[PDB]
Specification:
- It is classed as membrane protein.
- Keywords: lysosomal integral membrane protein 2, phospholipid receptor, membrane protein.
- The assembly is dimeric.
- Two copies of one chain form a homodimer.
- Chain A is α+β, with helices and mostly antiparallel strands and 324 residues long.
- Chain A has eight helices and 17 strands.
- Chain A has one domain.
- In chain A, helix 2 packs across helix 3.
- Chain A is globular, with a radius of gyration of 21 Å.
- The site of a molecule of 2 linked components (NAG-NAG) has 7 residues of chain A, from strand 3.
């Protein structure tokens, strides 16, 4: 019966890359992908937990019907496990007993929130700690998720958002912002881009700088993701080596749609407007046994990208300025 | 009100290596250890194990007796820092809260659990990470137990009431199913009158005779060995003063009745070690030598009694 509406409306939109030529990929050709999206989810805040409410009117189609053909992330994870000698004996045996495919078709809702994987369910009979369920956002609905932004510079360390924060120092263009995810695995630092105004209020625009085998502009986030072969990128390999783009037909990056930014009011430390824009990729290579990978090229294969956005409205901006 | 006595009495005895020269180790000298034990625990069952302490069959009280050995939680988190898992947080709190590489705790604290300062801190950020550490933490009362295969099954956590030949090999799984070990026929034995086959871990299984198990242990730097580096490279022994291996006390064996497949008598004898090396980013380590440092070894033993043996022979 709980879950309230946040002070500023936050929305996460998912965009999936549908694999149009799977048999052609296995025979060594360049992948051809087709971007399907958005699948708009409105955030809700009740500690502080968030819930995702689907908005069909603001989405491309129904995620409970719409199918996406992409890579089988569970088998590549359990293969990676096999290699580092974690459950090799079992994993090998069931991958031999139950032939799995590299390319798999599922509903958007199945990829996003969860599906029961054949091989994982088998592993679970032995290891009850290993979930049979897989999803890019599995069990993330209703949990105390939320990034952490910190201020730096010289000595100065101001916290702007600890899971979530709204309504002192001289914040300057010289200060850097350190951002951690819910899980604190790795950090990303965003530096001052320029001075902006947001619904009249002054703001400093922060952007991920150019300063951040394999190739530039991608982040191997494998340790944070239970050994799953996951690479991080900006949507469409924006700000990443040209090689990454040319590798996958369907990628067309541009700054206006694929950049990450966050406009913060200095005085208050309030985020007035922002866009969390990142892409999940899978590092795919040709492999000796179990799959069925064929003569696949070694590449950073895109699965899906998202946009987590917020924008202060005309009213709440003039109500915030009224509280001064 | 539950927990019954197993059909054959099983006992786990713990033996700890007490570090006599910690400051000397940090300055680069050879470690000097002193073996403290046994701490005898009688196993209880009702598929789930339960360890009951036997003071009368032990060296001292584990709730009083202290052991000075390595801070496994700091060594683990340092290893996480390196593989770039929570580098930023781990580094920051190791800087804010100066930790020692050598730490003193009660036997019961090392065995069943203690709250670690750094893990408690990490738990504030990562609720999925336990603040509690113990070599056997949360293992009391759980459905633990090995699996022994021939393709007939002798075990499956535990088994009693299979025609084995000297040619057959036995495959063993540890329940966590991480890795396997195979035991081959050593010789012919008699156990309480019953014929048996003595099965031993062969010579066929960093340096030889040690097993790296970091993946099975949440990235914690853990090496497995036989007690006192028995059947392992001499270099391993010479590295640590205090190690004196011998077959009679440190070998692992298992006497199986050829007809029924029943284990009549056996010794599960293994040692937990930590791979410790000197690191420049962690002042904690000093100028420590790169070595496979022993923490503790155990003996999980079973032996059929005069009565149950003559009751088993009666069923023939
Ligand atoms: C028991 O078993 C365990 C577990 O099974 C064994 O664990 C091993 O523990 C070590 C701990 O030090 C760990 O190594 C560390 O991790 C990285 C791997 O280093 C090795 O591999 C390097 C090859 O990768 C590089 O290759 C190209 C250059 O030739 C190029 O593509 C890259 O530079 C690439 O480096 C990468 O860097 C990224 C970080 O960037 P992003 O995430 O994209 O932002 C890493 O994520 C990625 O993993 C990769 O390494 C090779 O060059 C190197 O020489 C090693 O052979 C290194 O980053 C670490 O580097 C550090 O090495 C020194 C010593 O540790 C440090 O003092 C120094 O500061 C430096 O930073 C480091 O080597 C193993 O990965 C880990 N293995 C597993 C399976 O987890 C353990 O060894 C066993 N113990 C015993 C007792 O035997
Ligand atoms: C992402 O890319 C993937 C891969 O191309 C797309 O997935 C395909 O999506 C279509 C629907 O758009 C799926 O097609 C459906 O197949 C069903 C199963 O086939 C049966 O029927 C044939 C005979 O016709 C038998 O030979 C076969 O064995 C099965 O018994 C059909 O039931 C569906 O039929 C209906 O089609 C349309 C609606 O799509 C109706 O108008 C018709 O009247 C008819 O009732 C349908 O053809 C197909 O299965 C998917 N492929 C895979 C690999 O699963 C994604 O849709 C695409 N997503 C986006 C949004 O681009
Ligand atoms: C969350 O993040 C995503 C960013 O990835 C946003 O979605 C994008 O939204 C922008 C607008 O907010 C869209 O941009 C506009 O696209 C129009 C059509 O583009 C399609 O068609 C062209 C061919 O005609 C293709 O080349 C292209 O690939 C698209 O498929 C354009 O007509 C628009 O042009 C107008 O604006 C520009 C501004 O730079 C002017 O210069 C022009 O003159 C013109 O007036 C514009 O480019 C974008 O297409 C959306 N992408 C996706 C994938 O959905 C979300 O909106 C963002 N934020 C929120 C809150 O939702
Ligand atoms: C679980 O596993 C451990 C093995 O680590 C067992 O504990 C050992 O038990 C054996 C006996 O079962 C002990 O061996 C005996 O030790 C006596 C004293 O040894 C100490 O002192 C000598 C010097 O006097 C040192 O060299 C040595 O390192 C010890 O510190 C000896 O007097 C015994 O000798 C007798 O038996 C041998 C058998 O080979 C005969 O040849 C001799 O003639 C003589 O009669 C014997 O060696 C051993 O010390 C114990 N070790 C520890 C660390 O406790 C558990 O018993 C085992 N099983 C069960 C079910 O618990
Ligand atoms: C060799 C070592 C092996 C170790 C094995 C140990 C046991 C493993 C058990 C199960 C896993 C099996 C399947 C493998 C899963 C692979 C990981 C995965 O799935 O990778 C996909 C996504 C990608 O991440 P991303 O791009 O979204 O994030 C970006 C975040 N950055 C910044 C860190 C990059 O990972 C996600 O999203 C995560 C989705 C799952 C989240 C679960 C936790 C939910 C939150 C709180 C706890 C409560 C849950 C329990 C139930 C409570 C109610 C009863
Ligand atoms: C880079 C990747 C990082 C991933 C991080 C993921 C989250 C990690 C979370 C917490 C761990 C933090 C502390 C680090 C612990 C290091 C591991 C450890 O501690 O290493 C010590 C001992 C050594 O093992 P060993 O020599 O004895 O075995 C020999 C077995 N071989 C044959 C496989 C070699 O490890 C043991 O013993 C294990 C002791 C703990 C056992 C807990 C499970 C108990 C059983 C069943 C589940 C029920 C528990 C929950 C409560 C239920 C009631 C409410
Ligand atoms: C992204 O980061 C991940 C994790 O940080 C990183 O993972 C590395 O993957 C390889 C997978 O093969 C691991 O290397 C193996 O380690 C085991 C255990 O020690 C060995 O048995 C393996 O040996 C075989 O395979 C080798 C393949 O090169 C052969 O050379 C060898 O002869 C054997 O046949 C192998 O050495 C490696 O340990 C992990 N690292 C970690 C930290 O887990 C991955 O490389 C990064 N991905 C990208 C896209 O850069
Ligand atoms: C393993 O090695 C460690 C490290 O050497 C060793 O720990 C030490 O144990 C002694 C006790 O044996 C501890 O000393 C005690 O310290 C407290 C606190 O100050 C005092 O109250 C005690 O005083 C009594 O000391 C004698 C008895 O020990 C009495 O005769 C006397 O009258 C005093 O009342 C006592 O000094 C010491 O704290 C630890 N060291 C560390 C680092 O904690 C451990 O006991 C060894 N274990 C075995 C079984 O070998
Ligand atoms: C995420 O969790 C929220 C909260 O549980 C879900 O939203 C509610 O779901 C119930 C299901 O009975 C329905 O009444 C409504 O659809 C939602 N209620 C409100 C008040 O919004 C949400 O659907 C979950 N998201 C996903 C993807 O499963
Ligand atoms: C392991 O668990 C068992 C079972 O809970 C413990 O043994 C019992 O503990 C209760 C505690 O109130 C006492 O009645 C007795 O000491 C035990 N009862 C029986 C019937 O044996 C055991 O102590 C635990 N071991 C450790 C090391 O904590
Ligand atoms: C892995 C790399 C390439 C991605 C970089 C992380 C970027 C996209 C993150 C780090 C911190 C993030 C911000 C942190 C806080 C919030 C408040 C929330 O209510 C909406 C999203 C918003 C406004 C985020 C927008 C995007 C942001 C700036
Ligand atoms: C890590 C390596 C070096 C250790 C090798 C594993 C050895 C020690 C294992 C494999 C199978 C095991 C046996 C399997 C079954 C039982 C029955 C149980 O009621 C007591 C322990 C006992 C009798 C085990 C003793 C030790 C044993 C022989």
């Amino acid at each position: 019966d709980s879950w309230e509406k946040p002070p500023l409306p936050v929305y996460t939109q998912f965009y999936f890359f549908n694999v149009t030529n799977p048999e052609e990929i296995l025979r060594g050709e360049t992948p051809r992908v087709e971007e399907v999206g958005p699948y708009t989810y409105r955030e809700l805040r009740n500690v502080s937990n968030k819930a995702y409410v689907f908005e069909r009117d603001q989405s491309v189609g129904d995620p409970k019907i719409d199918l996406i053909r992409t890579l089988n992330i569970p088998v590549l994870t359990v293969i990676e496990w096999s290699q580092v000698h974690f459950l090799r004996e079992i994993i090998e045996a069931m991958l031999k007993a139950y032939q799995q495919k590299l390319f798999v078709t599922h509903t958007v809702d199945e990829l996003l929130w969860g599906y029961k994987d054949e091989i994982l369910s088998l592993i679970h009979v032995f290891r009850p700690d290993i979930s049979p369920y897989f999803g890019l956002f599995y069990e993330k609905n209703g949990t105390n998720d939320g990034d952490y932004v910190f201020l730096t510079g010289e000595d100065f360390t101001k916290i702007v958002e600890w899971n979530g924060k709204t309504s002192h120092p001289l914040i300057t263009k010289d200060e850097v912002l350190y951002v951690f995810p819910s899980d604190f695995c790795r950090s990303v630092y965003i530096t001052f881009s320029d001075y902006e105004s947001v619904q009249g209020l002054p703001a400093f625009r922060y952007k991920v700088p150019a300063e951040i085998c394999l190739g530039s502009g991608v982040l191997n986030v494998s340790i944070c993701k239970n050994g799953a072969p996951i690479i991080m990128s900006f949507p469409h390999f924006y700000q990443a080596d040209e090689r990454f783009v040319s590798a996958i037909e369907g990628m067309h990056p541009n700054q206006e749609d694929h950049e990450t930014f966050v406009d913060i009011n200095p005085l208050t430390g309030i985020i007035l407007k922002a866009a969390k824009r990142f892409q999940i990729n899978i590092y795919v290579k040709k492999l000796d046994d179990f799959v069925e990978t064929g003569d696949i090229r070694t590449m950073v294969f895109p699965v899906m990208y998202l946009n987590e956005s917020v924008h202060i409205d005309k009213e709440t901006a003039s109500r915030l300025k009224s509280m001064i």
